[PDB]
Enzyme design. Sequence first.
Site, PDB file in Angstrom:
ATOM      1  N   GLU A   1      44.870  48.656  31.869  1.00 56.15           N
ATOM      2  CA  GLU A   1      44.902  48.797  33.317  1.00 56.15           C
ATOM      3  C   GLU A   1      46.366  48.775  33.725  1.00 56.15           C
ATOM      4  OE1 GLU A   1      40.722  48.791  33.183  1.00 56.15           O
ATOM      5  OE2 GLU A   1      42.145  49.496  34.671  1.00 56.15           O
TER       6      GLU A   1
ATOM      7  N   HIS B   1      35.840  49.438  35.149  1.00 53.03           N
ATOM      8  CA  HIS B   1      37.255  49.479  35.500  1.00 53.03           C
ATOM      9  C   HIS B   1      37.985  48.153  35.311  1.00 53.03           C
ATOM     10  CE1 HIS B   1      36.515  53.549  36.701  1.00 53.03           C
ATOM     11  NE2 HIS B   1      35.688  53.184  37.666  1.00 53.03           N
TER      12      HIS B   1
HETATM   13 MG   LIG Z   1      39.563  50.737  32.862  1.00 57.32          MG
END
Ligand SMILES: [Mg+2]
EC number: 3.1.13.-
Lengths: 209, 209
Positions: free
Chosen positions: A22, A178
Site C-alpha cells: 500500500e 485494499h
Molecule cells: Mg491492496
Amino acid sequence: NAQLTGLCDRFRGFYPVVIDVETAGFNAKTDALLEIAAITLKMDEQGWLMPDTTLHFHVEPFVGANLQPEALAFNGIDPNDPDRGAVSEYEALHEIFKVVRKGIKASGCNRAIMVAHNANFDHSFMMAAAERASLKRNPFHPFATFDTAALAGLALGQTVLSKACQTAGMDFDSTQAHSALYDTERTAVLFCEIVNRWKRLGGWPLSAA
Amino acid sequence: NAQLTGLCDRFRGFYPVVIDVETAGFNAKTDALLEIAAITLKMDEQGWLMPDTTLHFHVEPFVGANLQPEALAFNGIDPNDPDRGAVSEYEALHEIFKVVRKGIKASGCNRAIMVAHNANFDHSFMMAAAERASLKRNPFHPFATFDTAALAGLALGQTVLSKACQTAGMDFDSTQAHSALYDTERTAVLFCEIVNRWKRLGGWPLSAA
DNA sequence: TAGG
DNA sequence: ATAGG
Ligand SMILES: [Mg+2]
Ligand SMILES: [Mg+2]
Ligand SMILES: [Mg+2]
Ligand SMILES: [Mg+2]
C-alpha cells in the site's frame, strides 16, 4: 524437506513470492511506501501449491516522500496513527529478504520472483525502496514478474482481483479489501488455485518432449 | 463479422495486441525507441486464437534521446542506416493506434491490452513515446498487460522466450531472434498457443458461473 | 538472472 | 468501472 518437493522444478528454479504494497500514491520514485505483505509458497506431497510463510510490515515514509490524500483516502492509512508500529524501509525489506533467501536455499531454487496483481506496480515500489535503503543481495528478479491479472485473464477470463477471486470460487470481502495482509493472502490463494487448476486439468506436467 | 467471434468475450472486453519494441537502452524515459511491431489477434470459427493484422515501424530517435552502444551491439540497429526508412514516434504510434481502435470497434471490445514478453518493458516504452508525441485516445490499458513470461511460466514452466517457444513445440531461430518483427510474431504464436492449449484441455470455457 |  | 493507490 523442501528440497524434495519440486517447487524448484515448477518455475525453472524461480521461488514465487506473493507481494502486495500500500502506498501514498502511484509514483514509485516519489510517493511513500506505507505497507507491504509477503507470502512465500510451498508444494505439498501431492504437488499442490499453497501458502507457506506470511510477513507483514507497516512502513515509515522515506525522507521527503510524497503523500497523496486520495491514496490515503483510498487505502484508509493514517501515517500518524500511533499504533501503526511503523518500521523503516530498510528494516521491513531486510526481514523480507532474509526470509526469502532462506526459503530459496531450503527449496533448491536460485532466485525469487514476485507474484502480485498488476505486478509491475508492486515490483516498482519494492525495487525503489530497496534502492533507497541500499539493500544488498536482493533475491528478487530485477525485471521479471508473475502478474496475477494476466494469469487470471488466461485461466478465468477475469483481470480484476475481486472478480477473478470470485470466478475461481473463492470468498472475497469488499470490506477487508485494499488492506495489505488481506490482498496479499487472496492473491496468493488465487495464484495457487490457477497453478493447481492447470495441474488438475492435465496441463502440467508436460508430455514426452 | 468480428462481433460474431467471441474475441470480446474471452478477455472481459479487452482486445489483445502483441507488441515488441527495440530500443537504444533500458530506460523508457531517456533511451531511444528504435523499432516497434504490433500484431492484433482474432478468433476463428472454432474459437481458436490466431494472429490477425501485422504492423512494423522503424522509429526515428526522439530529440535528445540517449543511444547506448551496447544496446545497438545487441539488436544490430544502425540508427543512421539509410535503408532503415525511419518514421517519427507520432507517425508509428498514430498508425498503430488507428489500426488497434478499428479492431476494437469491429470486434465489440472496449480497450486494448498489450501482450509482450516481460511486458512492462514494452509497455513503458510505448507509453513514454505515446506521451512525447502527445497521441490522443491511446487505446491501450494504462497499466494492465498480458505478460507472456508469466503465462509461459504457468503453462510451460519456462519464462525465457526462446525456451518457452521451443517447449511449446514452436520453431525458434537464434539467428532471427532480436528483430522486432520476428520476436513479435513468435510471441503472438506463443500467446495463442497458450490460450488455445487452455481451451484444448477443457480449462475454458468454465463450468460454474 | 535474458525484457535492450 | 479502464480498478495496481
Ligand atoms: Mg491492496
Ligand atoms: Mg495491490
Ligand atoms: Mg522484446
Ligand atoms: Mg526483440
